[model samples]
Target chain A: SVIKSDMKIKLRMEGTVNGHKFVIEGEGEGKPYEGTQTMNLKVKEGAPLPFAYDILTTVFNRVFAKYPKHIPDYFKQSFPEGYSWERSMTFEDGGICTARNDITLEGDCFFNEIRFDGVNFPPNGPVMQKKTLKWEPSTEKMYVRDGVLTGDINMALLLEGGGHYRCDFKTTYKAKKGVQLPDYHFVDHCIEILSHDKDYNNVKLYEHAVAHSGLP
Target chain B: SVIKSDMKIKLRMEGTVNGHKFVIEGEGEGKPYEGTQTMNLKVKEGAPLPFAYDILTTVFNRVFAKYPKHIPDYFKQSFPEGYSWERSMTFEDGGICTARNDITLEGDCFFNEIRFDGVNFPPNGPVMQKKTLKWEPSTEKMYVRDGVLTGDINMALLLEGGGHYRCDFKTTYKAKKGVQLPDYHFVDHCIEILSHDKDYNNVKLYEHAVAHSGLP
Candidate 1:
């Protein structure tokens, strides 16, 4: 029964930056009795920038949102007050539905590694080598509507082993919208990971359609 | 909008065990934007047994359900084959949404402490010096019905400390006829902590109403 609901969440992203093309699509389903939501998003690995973008999205959508503490030190440090976000859930197999963002960034301003005990870490382990992120939100149009929030965000990150990358992410809140939820709040997201890196100098564009159902 | 759906989940549990009286009721509201679902259950601190039972239920309903892995050695050790459970989330803050069962019961079989870095653990430290648990399930009537599972579980635990103690927890699963969940599963719990000790005695009844909504 739980799987039926989870399967409804769909994710898709496709675009090109500097002639580099990449597409990332994923679907998830779960059963509460089984005790965990299973989400699978695959990126047809090709260009370095797109691959990094895909990996970053996975971290943002999956890890950062799910386990905010896992967000690298660099990113958390940038948002001392807090990063605005939300999701939809009540409980999970592992436990009750939970979300967190009040993470205390203890180290330097640069991105630092967030350790993943065997269980929480992704199967392949850390996606970026000491990857750090910084977000600069546009103060102009940030506002709340009918209990929903809307804002434009510019983000830049340093991938120690990978290359430096940046993105433009627009965030919003709505009711019965993205996932077709009848009465719920969701983070409506439209993001593009565009960058000119040493490995792929042209313009690499990796667009993403991301949103999550939230509970309060 | 998300709050409306979450606000609909109402929890209540009240019953008698060995002539003791106690009731636990809770109401929770959450939206992904909030980051975490907060539910607080409390009992007057006059009676140690009831107080402990209230605390136990919080662990069982919240921690055990949300982060079951944190259950002490005695409990996890009994389920060598594993106890089946589920929920509706992917990850949480402070750390990942981690549920553990393969607990390496280091000390003894009855009351070995499960480590809680700083959050869930007691301010002083582990509540029990060395705790261990054992389970005895009913052999008959344990089967699956329309994708719903029903079973009777009998549980026992030993707490070693300045004073040693034990408890009996009998658990059962039911359908809409129970909580009107329609298609959802609910754990019908009836438990009594009876122990004659220098600290506190007299049978104490602790009942729990546990069921959660899934995501789509």
Candidate 2:
């Protein structure tokens, strides 16, 4: 005898899914008896106050509206590779200070090191950078210009949306000193992935990764 | 099997041994055939701009002069255990803000949790603390009042002098969000053990550990 649809479930999940306001709530009113199964969803009709965001939001509405039909056109976006030039960063301790970095992606790795020429900080509290900021544990070559060493990577993203990122060294002995190969590390901050915009940072250079390695 | 001693040696070790002005530079002029091992010693005739430091410096000088006899009395200090408390701390990011904590110790472990009563920070950038800060991997009770859960530890000092210290929960996810049980950790600061100093924090209850577990 074939099995009946005896699964009874109430699905209600509401949270930011891939940086978009999405709320999905549904339930099978009754199991195998096949009663009224109702469902509803509300993709928050929200976008930016910025003029650019407004234009982008309007186009996004139209694009999303035409979903699943031209899926190839939308899904066939570029994987994050090549130079993501001049991405901005700030130290949590250095108040109001900002810096620029040019992240590079090659193969399955990414390197986002501090750009010396673009560093900006206060007079006393200047930027403290390292010569050999490692992207992975095994690599030893200093992050030289076009030098082929990674910052901290794995372009092998976790999902089509976004999953995680890893920051390298988090110890003074490790980050600064170099002699102390300590266990464990921490990233300063996590990156936010918006839509697969051509000009992600407005530089028309960065190709955002589909997903990232899970954070530790 | 009575061979002559013929080994060239040059001892030039300087910097900070423990936390004192320690320097021992003695290089053998020639091989162990022994011409002359010209050596000069200077214990940095320094100390005490502070009145307590002055008194302590004088006592240290006097004790150094009378070495190797009453060594037992001086060496027989206390192992760091129990409430070592009301210790002060400041965040690197938070300018001028201060906080206090009362660290605890059980067998081979130490826990320094933020004392709720003693917390002090600016109104805007308030203290962001967590309930469960592990001293080491394993053990998961909330760090309750005089709670058994340790913060980040290994009371085993690296040496009778001092080698290194460990701080716990560098990542926000691991430190703040309990759900993200990630690998790897970082310490905020390392402790300095100076000659088994009692009342190390000055309030009198701390007994510096001897030869702690090495840093990661």
Candidate 3:
């Protein structure tokens, strides 16, 4: 049954980063049934933003995009031998970076470790970047049911030069229920970034979402 | 002076939602000084999950995408006379909804009210929605400095159909400092969504990011 109706989405965000406070309120509409959407953001305050912030934003979109597609395979334990994949990014300054997740699935859809390694640009010169960070998880877990998946995430970043970034949170992946086909999924992430670096200036990113719904 | 450097970006998120505890950790490197990056999300926990959970996950991504581009124009008071917009979404079951924000910029980047009106599909129904909700903001404030912006946002959703979803939070929008062109921005949001419905069950969306960075 193809459904057709209009829905409105309202967004309000408020938090402090790098010692500055701000808010963003946006409203838009879309057809979840049709996959069409539009929105606009409004803000107050002027503080220097960080690149990590942009990454954080897209992470959700990526996760939502990937969850449904990957969950079935993840549940069936269906990865090619060695069970791992890699992704990389290139910069205008001729620098490149990549992440390689070595997937080891234990029983109950759990992964042993997903390691990360990457190169980055330096303050000056054409010198190619060396591995600046390595991401290793202290604990990893996942579960899927009724087209939804829940995960507990705990990981840390071991900086190449010398620094540390740690994030710990929970995630909920929900596939659109009933009527909607092709199984579109949305991911809810309760995340926080705690980094203490005198050299990096007490960088902190704390983002989280916690909810009580029908979970088993 | 312009700055250039390859930097490792680390992130840590930690929090609890509806009695379930969880954590997520990740790491990657990018050039705020240049522009490129990569990272992976890892998890731990075997808690039950919910459908609204996925909505929570991508909400950050959606907000992040809209904040940067909209903040600047919002701050500059760039909207033409009668600056307001509308969007609607449709459900396959003949459900339709809409949110119309009547934008009125108050002094110093503050908005007086952002009211929303919409209809929605009932949990079980052949019945159509009829203005099931109306949203109104109680307090709104904003500030800007050196291209970065901070905002104080407090809003509530009033459900006319006899249910409730309310959210309140603060946001900080940071522009790329001493680097990047066109003044790109990132936002941090500390938000909480509380909903109540006896027939629909208790729905709680508590998403937040608390930072201990240079705040007064």
Candidate 4:
């Protein structure tokens, strides 16, 4: 397999329960660093199927049913305005790493898939050369709408030699001024990533939120 | 018991399940036709409690949980635009009941309760001087919100003589034009009611909608 460097993932679920039916969808993406990097592989094995599955079943599912009107309430996103975000990561090893969000739209769809793909990166590159990398949702309750994207980010940072780097994201966006307006700007960038904590994951956060909400 | 002619009711529910806690609320009101009408009642016996109970448990509860973002989709409502609705009822008895909703507001809260209270009415009367009347929601699922209240009206037209009147609502609004423009306006009033059907109800509709969505 050619060691390419970029990715994309979109997962949707349709199901029913006790007379209720619904549609749930989620996406993730990866862009290459040097611009001319590409990789092709099989679906089941050499892929991020596990990551996608984890998102649709556990993370995305709970969010859809429970917090139908909250994910967007909090998260780092840019839309309607320009498209970009900043994610800073502070690791336990006393080192600071950052994941940048500079997503360019593709006609109707946006390229913010999970893992990696025909992704283009900044002059610094996608992960800034962090050995082997992967992409997962920043938080369990991620908020995504027609034109707004904000919330947790990805953490797959494995230093080829050893060890791992798990981080969440903090956010702010590039303001887009509408016509006849200067003091007012809106944010709704399609998709982007930023950075987070001491080996934490969204699945745990999901349980905590449900617990606080009063559950079975 | 002073046989006065007016009514009002409000109900709310709070509970937790599978770690998800939430708050549910509902309200119903009854206004008389004559400008001056009042009545006093008890909690259980001389009560509209059954109506209130069925609403909170059967009607309101189902709506809050299942169609969180849909009731408002279809219901006769008027708000920021004004504060009223018109419910026309065509009974199997070939009689027509025009429930004129000309509610006069009161500070923070509005006057639209269930059963009967200090209910005022038109020149003729509340229910136009119909028989022994009662007020139940026209449909099981009612659409209500902060400002714009549009949905099923109440059905409690049991003539002083006999029989019952059950009707749903159809809708239209008295558009409110905004500034600097002639053909533009937005909607977001508080609560109001309208009417609907042919021997049918919203509880059945709820099941139908869920089934269409692909349910269990």
Candidate 5:
């Protein structure tokens, strides 16, 4: 059966760089986002899946938004900026609907599928390597919209790789000196979109995201 | 350090439906089909990853090759002969390097992801619905060369849902399949790529693939 109602919401999120937090808001779609936001989530204590979503997402957020101890030195040396995150609602059943995410340096860089097809790496050429420096995420909200669950996410990155080849990614987000930014705030949906992990074509990282999501 | 070697092998794969097994063979690339194929995958004895990789690939082969149990009734019930698959290869680490397989469905009817946008469900329809009937990885194979892995996957489908109001999808895979043959493989190369999880997408049909293999 189809449910009817005009429910609209725009989430506002903001974060600090040197050290501070701000706000950004935007409208959400779908049943999961149609539901209400909540901070308190309960688990059956012993069960996993949905029961573990909160803590799992929490850990993911912590690692991506805040400085995770396990982060490698390479990524640390490149990015260096740490962060925090929040998810207001989420809804992926252990059933049909599924979502995946992964923090990776193995896949195509900047999200482009660049095969060695056109470019050749010398068989004995210098091998470039990458190391992750930092990743952390923190969640501050959760709730249901319509019937689906939704959430806010904030993350930070630090990456290091070797190569005489240098490239700069042209992101839609432009940072002014000392200005705080939300990873995927209303004005900047790129982070949130990529954060979903669906945008990536790398099979391994994409699978990791699904295995690690905070939803059942 | 980089390890390089020319390995020779001839790989064969066969699929059965209604008790008929069809054999397919292919010669490994860059090596003679001379030596008897063999491999010694090494690991930290206790490291579950390698073992899990072995078990999971085996189970995947079994489940995808034989359709009676895993193949959806939508396709098998009609084509009692079900579908047969074949592929052969040689692995850089050892085994198949180049393999190809063909599945023969007695009648033309088959299950496939003809068209699906996933995001573009019919409006006013349930935001969530079974997109495909039970799908089974009918015929499949896997092999890793260098650090890259690839494979093909096909499935038998029993599509459910009626009317335009249903969450029936409309996308490109449909254009290629034609109106009568709706079978789809979703392309296994992407899904069968090395994964840390036990089940496909972690939806867990053959959870034992992961369970019996134990956790990493």
Candidate 6:
């Protein structure tokens, strides 16, 4: 049943499952069938984003890094028991390949996959970031701060690859207002599994397919 | 048992009632032992500048004249089964006075002792108008020919002498949407009574009350 074609998997979103583009389709049991599902996706401490695995990881980390504020407090107040913390990336050792980025936020957020071309950013580490960095409309500008929320989006990007690269980006801003909460312990549950070199690896976050079509 | 008080009554128009300003207190043989009732009062209407009987006749004529158009419409709208118009008045020409100014508007509206005050424009005839020709915030100008869709206040005047007068106007505008229903045909009914004074000199229409507490 483990027959593989060009496999694309999407996870963690809002509204209806399929309506949000959280589609995962591949050849299984020798036939081709398309299905949709929601996954348990979360961010944990020390999660690694290797460049070769996905360019999206770098883009997500960078995006999440620049601005960290809650904007939904105006309508819905009070967060759950634990939340994430916003962190910054610094060179651990000023060396050629000795570079380490820390997981700033011990919290989690929801995001979805959007269609992108390969000539744009890939879906993993380096390329995933190049493809995603500026596709979101709300992130067009920096507008949030520590307690005072602000955001900023940089649109300038380079698409050297030619294939279709799908980009996944977080949608809601529900930025922190007034007083921001501390780091959440729930982030420890994140699975950061890295393989390739520092240029290519991924934080193996938990995600599952919520729906699968019945095959004949 | 009949009791009499040689009281001096002052009204704007002759033969009308004041009712509220000055009340009548007398001993009754009923369960309450002693009861108090209000007497009819009039305002200054015609000759002598205060209590001219002519002004009383003029006021009655105005009401009776308008009754055929205003009173019947309101009553028939409220009670359509079977109802009769009953009227009587005492004036200078009491012997030759016979005019009715009461009616039912089917099932459209209901009115009690409602009344109106208007000025004689000679050329334009008798158009029901506010007691005071000037407009002030404290003034209640409820007579509307078009805005009748919203209920209007009924102006019941208390006549002291020829031109001395005071009025009480109450209203309830509950008509839904744009139905041609005035604020309670209360004052309109009074307008009809006053307009009919031309035919009857005895039955004078001047200060009308929302609810009559005592007899003439």
Q: Write the per-residue lDDT of candidate 1 for residues B1-216, one digit (tens) a residue.
A: 111212212234332211123444433332212122333333323343322332243222211222122222221223322222221112111111111222211122111111111111111222322232211111212334433333322333333333223222212222212221123322323333323243333323233223323233
lDDT of 4 by residue, A1-216 (tens): 111233333443332211112343445433322211111111332222212211222122111112222222121122323343333332232222222333434433333322111011111222323333333322322333222333344444444456555543333222233212111112211211222122112211111122012222
What C-alpha lDDT do the candidate models reach, one value each? 0.27, 0.20, 0.30, 0.26, 0.20, 0.22
Candidate 3 positional error at A92, Å:
28
Over the stretch A58-90, how does candidate 2's per-residue lDDT look in tens digits? 001000011122122111121232222111112
Candidate 3, residues B81-195, lDDT tens digits: the string is: 3232222222233222222223332321212121111122233332222232433423334454334343434444445556544443333332222312223333333333344
Per-residue C-alpha lDDT of model 4 across residues B99-180, encoded as one tens digit per residue: 2222333432233322111111121232323332334323322332222223333344444456655433322122122212
Residue B113 lDDT in candidate 3: 21
How far residue B51's Cα lies from its native spot in candidate 1, in Å, is 16
Rank order (by TM-score, best first): 3, 1, 5, 4, 6, 2
For residue B108, model 1's alpha carbon misses the true position, in angstroms, by 7.2
Task: Show model 5 residue runs off by greater than 4 Å.
Answer: A1-130, A136-146, A151-157, A162-216, B1-132, B136-157, B162-216
What value does the lDDT take at residue A101 in candidate 5? 21
lDDT of 6 at A136: 18
Instruction: Judging by lDDT, tell me the better candidate of 3 and 5.
Output: 3
TM-score to native of every candidate shown: 0.25, 0.15, 0.27, 0.19, 0.21, 0.16
Q: Poorest 10 consecutive residues of model 5 chain B by lDDT?
A: B112-121
What local lDDT score does residue A141 receive in model 6, on the 0 to 100 scale?
28
Superposed model 6: Cα runs more than 4 Å off = A1-11, A14-20, A23-148, A155-158, A161-172, A175-177, A180-216, B1-216
**C-alpha lDDT (0 to 100) for residue B119 of candidate 4:** 10
Clash number for candidate 2: 15
Instruction: Give each prediction's DockQ, rounded to 2 decimals.
Output: 0.03, 0.02, 0.01, 0.01, 0.01, 0.00
Candidate 1 residue spans exceeding 4 A from truth: A1-80, A84-97, A102-188, A191-216, B1-58, B61-187, B191-216
lDDT of 1: 0.27
lDDT of 5: 0.20
Residue B24's lDDT within candidate 1 is 42
Q: How well is candidate 4 docked (DockQ)?
A: 0.01
